Design a protein around this ligand. Structure first.
Ligand SMILES: OC[C@H]1O[C@@H](O)[C@H](O)[C@@H](O)[C@@H]1O
Length: 791
């Protein structure tokens, strides 16, 4: 089989994401830009369009990046003031783009009254571009040049505001920055254009010129101040952060307790037209544990466009306490012409708005439950402007799922609690989070897998398992203790077993393993496109937050469908994404390659990406599992967090990726969750992921990540602790066959501290995964051959 990867269709797919992911925040009709307008573009970052964040998910090599000025010229709908372009060009020869550990921003060119006045005299409209990047190992700081405007950027904005009566501000940013000073200066239009990959300027020009009507929505709540965010109190400590806000993350906090601290609510975004959402039929089916809600969205303005219907549930406070509203469903309309409408119907399972009882107060400890009382469903344009769709009342609690006490905090701390005041409004009070009473050593011992007796005369290939000819158990008996100790080691970076410049090879990492037809499976960064450290080019796609802002799983899936083929072309089997850690705080540096403060949106967008990658047999690796919500101190840092917050917020997106997304590969973190490293955490990697969610796949460490037993010293070679957790793969070693990290797999096995059954389980996970990859198909000679056309 031979498949064409059409590069022009790939471009168009990515461009569609850009034009659906831009978020228009304010506009007085200055957008869209009028046909034949002359635009003056301000901001030195105009010449170096941020196509991505920095670090592992920002090192995609490309031949060309289309920035905003070039996008606008290629549109043929406007022209750009060339004199001002040359002023920026000539100044930049003297003040070159700093490539660094790259800085968050570039120094702005100071502007004079003469430049700005002369620009306005020869143009119809000013566009001011403020650029920010961020990423791995540095957190975004609440200072000028990072989250705040620089003094010279502010001066630029004030001068342009004075001399132009039409002003447009664009935020070419990985994550949201302070809007207070920008809002005070009061431009005529404000749009967040994120970082759109290599064709970002094309999709951005589409929305600016009106060829596409913007339809992007915020995936985070924008508060007035950094200190309004509930997590700011407990964010940015390199050693330990207590997740005291608990389930009250983002709009779960603000809509419940602090509506007046919101500038822009979750799900907010506007269009060049206006829409009217009319609530429709509502039914509930308690026996099936679903409800069905309908509404109609009508374009009531004068230009075609899409809108998003967003559905929320208000649960009764009960004994647990609840956020006012939780997102349970959304649907983006087709393009609606003026005066036309679309009926949207959603069926919502009760598990979308259940609560995890981690205290026992409901009578069902360690369960997801719907407490007795009234459930009100809302629909609207955003969480704030969502209106009653229907209600139903439960006279008794319904247990949606029985789970276990898992990943519980090892120390007490106080968490936020919804308290219903005398009047009936909700205030924040605090309560003690109960401590874990789980016997961890016992749990491991009681659920120990059975050893498979070894048999080295067996000549079964991995091909014989794939065809159904033999059981995986029969095959795995062939692996020696050497083979077992070797197969749990990933080799990289730049292993010679796979495409050069990628992150890792795993599976067939010795002559012996490859002789059994276990192929070398290739892993590579990242969510926004293949990072090839050989210098080879690949498609640079929009950042994760831009993807999520589309509220459009279909457009995301379509784009990653092309990535699926591109990966096969490069013989990359595992793309190291989606990044899908919750936006707990706006200052986390890696927010650009994650999706949302909301777990449902997070899991739904992740799943769309995975479905895309699955189209032609490629795959993603969900990361970082879990609670890597802060870059500072991420090697040592301990996230202290309640079971409920884990179950409803931080794990929830990952759960969705497994059950809806078909996720079969996970990456753990550099850090600790509840007092041990995640790579050695049994509750995370076995109890929750496998035994409760039913995940069938592989777990790998983060690259050169530390591992420990609870209480013990962290090291980059405690592979025994890793295998005891069912974290299947240590990424990475320079030479896996030679044990170049000097790991303790065999010595622990020798001492009876690691059981061979545990190694065998990991080996089976690895082989089961490996045999369904395109690398196996290359051995079997039935892989897809890809040819790139259109270039
Ligand atoms: O590049 C391989 C890995 O490196 C680590 O530093 C990052 O945390 C991961 O996100 C990445 O996938």
């Amino acid at each position: 089989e031979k498949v064409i990867l059409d590069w022009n269709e790939y471009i168009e797919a990515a461009r569609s994401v850009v034009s659906e992911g831009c978020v228009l925040l304010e506009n007085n009709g200055t957008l869209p830009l009028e046909k034949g307008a002359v635009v003056s573009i301000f901001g030195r970052i105009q010449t170096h369009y941020y196509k991505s964040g920095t670090g592992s998910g920002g090192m995609v090599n490309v031949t060309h990046v289309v920035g905003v000025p070039e996008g606008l010229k290629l549109s043929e709908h406007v022209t750009v003031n060339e004199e001002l372009e040359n002023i920026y060009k000539e100044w930049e020869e003297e003040n070159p783009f700093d490539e660094g550990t790259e800085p968050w921003s570039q120094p702005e060119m100071e502007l004079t009254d003469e430049i700005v006045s002369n620009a306005s005299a020869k143009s119809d409209v000013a566009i001011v571009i403020i650029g920010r990047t961020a990423g791995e190992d540095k957190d975004f700081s609440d200072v000028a040049g990072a989250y705040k405007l620089s003094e010279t950027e502010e001066d630029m904005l004030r001068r342009v505001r004075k001399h132009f009566d039409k002003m447009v501000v664009l935020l070419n940013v990985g994550s949201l920055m302070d809007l207070n000073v920008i809002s005070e200066i009061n431009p005529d239009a404000l749009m967040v254009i994120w970082q759109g990959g290599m064709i970002g300027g094309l999709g951005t020009a589409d929305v600016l010129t009106g060829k596409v009507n913007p339809s992007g929505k915020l995936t985070d709540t924008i508060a007035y101040e950094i200190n309004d965010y509930p997590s700011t109190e407990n964010f940015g400590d390199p050693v330990r952060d207590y997740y005291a806000e608990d389930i009250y993350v983002g709009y779960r906090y603000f809509e419940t307790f602090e509506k007046s601290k919101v500038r822009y609510p979750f799900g907010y975004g506007i269009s060049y037209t206006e829409f009217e959402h009319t609530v429709g039929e509502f039914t509930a089916d308690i026996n099936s544990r679903t409800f069905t809600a309908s509404c109609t969205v009508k374009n009531t303005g004068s230009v075609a466009g899409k809108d998003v219907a967003q559905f929320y549930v208000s649960a009764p406070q009960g004994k647990l306490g609840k956020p006012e509203k939780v997102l349970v469903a959304f649907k983006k309309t087709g393009i609606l012409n003026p005066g036309k409408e679309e009926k949207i119907t959603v069926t919502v399972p009760f598990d979308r708005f259940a609560s995890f009882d981690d205290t026992g107060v409901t009578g069902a400890e360690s369960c997801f439950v719907l407490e007795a009382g009234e459930y009100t469903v809302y629909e609207g344009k955003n969480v704030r402007e969502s209106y009653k769709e229907g209600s139903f009342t439960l006279e008794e609690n319904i247990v949606t799922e029985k789970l276990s006490k898992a990943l519980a905090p090892m120390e007490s701390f106080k968490r936020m609690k919804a308290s219903e005041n005398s009047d009936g409004t909700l205030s924040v009070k605090y309560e003690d989070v109960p401590v874990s009473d789980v016997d961890e050593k016992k749990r491991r011992l009681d659920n120990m897998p059975v050893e498979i007796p070894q048999d080295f005369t067996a000549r079964y290939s991995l091909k014989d398992v794939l065809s159904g000819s033999v059981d995986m158990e029969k095959f795995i008996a062939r692996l020696s203790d050497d083979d077992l100790a070797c197969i749990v080691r990933g080799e990289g970076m730049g292993s010679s077993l796979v495409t050069a410049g990628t992150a890792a090879a795993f599976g067939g990492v010795s002559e012996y393993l490859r002789k059994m037809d276990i192929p070398a499976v290739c892993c590579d960064d990242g969510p926004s496109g293949m990072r090839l450290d050989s210098g080879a080019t690949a498609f640079s796609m929009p950042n994760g937050t831009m993807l999520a802002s589309t509220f459009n799983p279909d457009v995301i899936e379509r784009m990653y469908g092309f990535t699926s083929l591109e990966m096969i072309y490069n013989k990359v089997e595992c793309l190291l994404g989606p990044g899908m850690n919750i936006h707990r705080n706006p200052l986390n540096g890696r927010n650009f390659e994650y999706f949302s403060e909301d777990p449902y949106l997070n899991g739904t967008i992740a799943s769309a990406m995975l479905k895309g990658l699955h189209k032609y047999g490629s795959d993603g690796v969900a990361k970082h599992f879990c609670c890597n919500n802060q870059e500072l101190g991420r090697q040592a840092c301990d996230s202290v967090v309640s079971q409920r917050a884990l179950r409803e917020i931080y794990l929830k997106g990952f759960e969705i990726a497994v059950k809806e997304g078909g996720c079969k590969a996970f990456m753990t973190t550099y850090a600790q969750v509840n007092g041990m490293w995640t790579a050695g955490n049994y509750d995370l990697n076995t109890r929750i992921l496998r035994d409760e969610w039913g995940f069938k796949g592989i777990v790998m460490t983060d690259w050169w990540a530390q591992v420990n037993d609870r209480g013990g010293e962290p090291t980059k070679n405690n592979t025994a602790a890793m295998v005891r957790a069912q974290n299947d793969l240590y990424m990475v070693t320079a030479n896996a066959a030679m044990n170049s990290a000097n790991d303790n797999t065999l010595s622990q096995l020798s001492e009876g501290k690691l059981n061979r059954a545990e190694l065998q389980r990991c080996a089976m996970n690895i082989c089961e995964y490996a045999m369904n990859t395109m690398a196996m198909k290359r051995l079997c000679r039935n892989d897809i051959k890809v040819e790139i056309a259109g270039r």
